[PDB]
Amino acid sequence: EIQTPDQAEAFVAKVFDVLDSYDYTRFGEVLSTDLKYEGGLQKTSGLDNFINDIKASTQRMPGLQTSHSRYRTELTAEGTIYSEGHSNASLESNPGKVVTVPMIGVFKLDSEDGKIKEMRIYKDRLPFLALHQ
Amino acid sequence: EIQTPDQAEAFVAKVFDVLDSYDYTRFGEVLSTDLKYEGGLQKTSGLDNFINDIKASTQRMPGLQTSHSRYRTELTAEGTIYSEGHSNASLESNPGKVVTVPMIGVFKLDSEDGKIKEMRIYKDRLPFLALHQA
Ligand SMILES: CC(C)C1=C(C(=O)O)[C@](C)(C[C@H]2[C@H]([C@@H](C)C=O)CC[C@H]2C)C=C1
Ligand SMILES: CC(C)C1=C(C(=O)O)[C@](C)(C[C@H]2[C@H]([C@@H](C)C=O)CC[C@H]2C)C=C1
């Protein structure tokens, strides 16, 4: 399935395309039922727990929009995907105010179906405070 | 010379041993003079610029103390070191208030002398605001 860095990067792109849509009914297309997720101090086990965690943060930030880009992905001999890129966010209240930070995603895939079973996203959230005027 | 993940991880531990001492005269033992560093929106080119960036940031937080641990390191076929661990910080004024966040370091080494020529550190700094409060 995923054999090259380019295919890994395209998969990560597809994953964030789903995630940034906030269409939770599709998250299971790409995330395993027992997903282990860490995002700084946010940590969840299982797909429903992942979805509930995002929903909570999203109610906290109404009007939130996010997007992601990638520029450097490796696919290692252990099967790990390391993907460096950037994370963008804006608030619908002032959508022209965009905050962008570097990010890296660490992914391990399910050997059976190729879904993400471990996802650890690293980025500095402090700059997103600038979304509040 | 680094050929295994365990040696990669042991080297990263020593690197942060030097960095967390804030003894800037030693940074060149492990960092190349043309080091390319990115730490969130912090970005520097050259060792002197890296050092000045840290010095500026430390002036903002007197009494800062830091340490690091590691748990999962890979050394790839491209020579890249990816090292996941944690970043701890406290203030000397209140040393028992510790804030710890996950972190990962991305490193490329100088083929000549084995020093770090690229270092990109990723972590959420927002929790460290709790070091001002109480
Ligand atoms: C302030 C930032 C921009 C923020 C996110 C975060 O930093 O946790 C969340 C809580 C979740 C992100 C997800 C995680 C897995 C990020 O990669 C994917 C996209 C978005 C739903 C949404 C906005
Ligand atoms: C608030 C946080 C904890 C903080 C750091 C940071 O987040 O930039 C700096 C500015 C620099 C770090 C260095 C960079 C390369 C971090 O990895 C190494 C250790 C410390 C000297 C010091 C404390």
UniProtKB/Swiss-Prot annotation, chain B:
Q: Which UniProt keywords apply?
A: Antibiotic biosynthesis
Q: Which Gene3D superfamilies match?
A: 3.10.450.50
Say which domain of life the source belongs to: Eukaryota
The protein's matches in Pfam families, at most eight in alphabetical order, are given as: SnoaL_2
Keyword Nucleus part of the UniProt annotation: no
According to its UniProt entry, what is the function of this protein? Answer: Part of the gene cluster that mediates the biosynthesis of sordarin and hypoxysordarin, glycoside antibiotics with a unique tetracyclic diterpene aglycone structure. First, the geranylgeranyl diphosphate synthase sdnC constructs GGDP from farnesyl diphosphate and isopentenyl diphosphate. The diterpene cyclase sdnA then catalyzes the cyclization of GGDP to afford cycloaraneosene. Cycloaraneosene is then hydroxylated four times by the putative cytochrome P450 monooxygenases sdnB, sdnE, sdnF and sdnH to give a hydroxylated cycloaraneosene derivative such as cycloaraneosene-8,9,13,19-tetraol.
| Gene Ontology BP terms | antibiotic biosynthetic process
What is the name attached to this protein's record? Sordarin/hypoxysordarin biosynthesis cluster protein G
Gene from which this protein is expressed: sdnG
UniProt-listed SUPFAM superfamilies: NTF2-like (SSF54427)
Which InterPro entries does the record associate with it?
Answer: NTF2-like_dom_sf, SnoaL-like
Task: Identify the pathway.
Answer: Antibiotic biosynthesis
